[PDB]
Amino acid sequence: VTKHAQIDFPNTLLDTKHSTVEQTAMQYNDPM
Amino acid sequence: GQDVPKRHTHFVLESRLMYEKSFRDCWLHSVCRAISQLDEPLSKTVVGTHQKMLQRKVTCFQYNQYGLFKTPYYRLANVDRYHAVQGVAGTREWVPYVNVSYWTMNKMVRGGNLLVHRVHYTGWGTDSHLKKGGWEHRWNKVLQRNVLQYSRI
């Protein structure tokens, strides 16, 4: 069993047109 | 890795042993079937009750062989050796010369191991007999090369 990583802000209604390092910083709970 | 899991190696080796048992048993089973299922007399020497007694005795000999390979060849002639995908002989899921599936043939085409020439997918390749009559004509041409060119003796 692997526990998925969690962020504070919801991922619903987030734009997928962001850059790759912006989504990278966004998903690891440390946004730019 | 590494090549293929060992259960598939066991399966291919059991297929090879079934082929070897076919080579072991086919002549004996064919002679027993051709004696036991004949109604005409075998010879001038053996007729009447001797022929029926000999047919019953060879039927008793044929039924007493535990493990005699009477299985036809086309039932397990679709076994692949590199991968575990099972194809069907007669369809496009199997190639007959290198004896692998369509998936394994595509991987060995894309890997560069074979020396195969690509031709247009709606033509008949290059073989004049294949362009002439199709698969049946090349089938008959392989028959004519293998058997019918020899005057039997």
């Binding site: - | 090549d3 190696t9 004896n99 008959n140």
Partner: protein, 60 residues
């Protein structure tokens, strides 16, 4: 017939419906599968070719 497309001067098939395996005269005149292509398939189609050229213990 020479005016057909698949013309080969030997009769490739006998005109007999139901010339099957149960008939003993078919069994008598059939080719046995001893040293046909099946023997090459039985002794060559191995999942690793190196187990067909030697024993692995001997090479190591």
């Amino acid at each position: 017939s020479p005016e057909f497309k698949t013309f080969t001067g030997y009769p490739m098939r006998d005109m007999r419906p139901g010339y099957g395996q149960n008939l003993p005269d078919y069994i008598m005149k059939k080719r046995l599968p001893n040293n046909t292509h099946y023997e090459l398939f039985a002794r060559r189609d191995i999942p690793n070719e190196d187990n067909a050229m030697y024993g692995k213990y001997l090479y190591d």
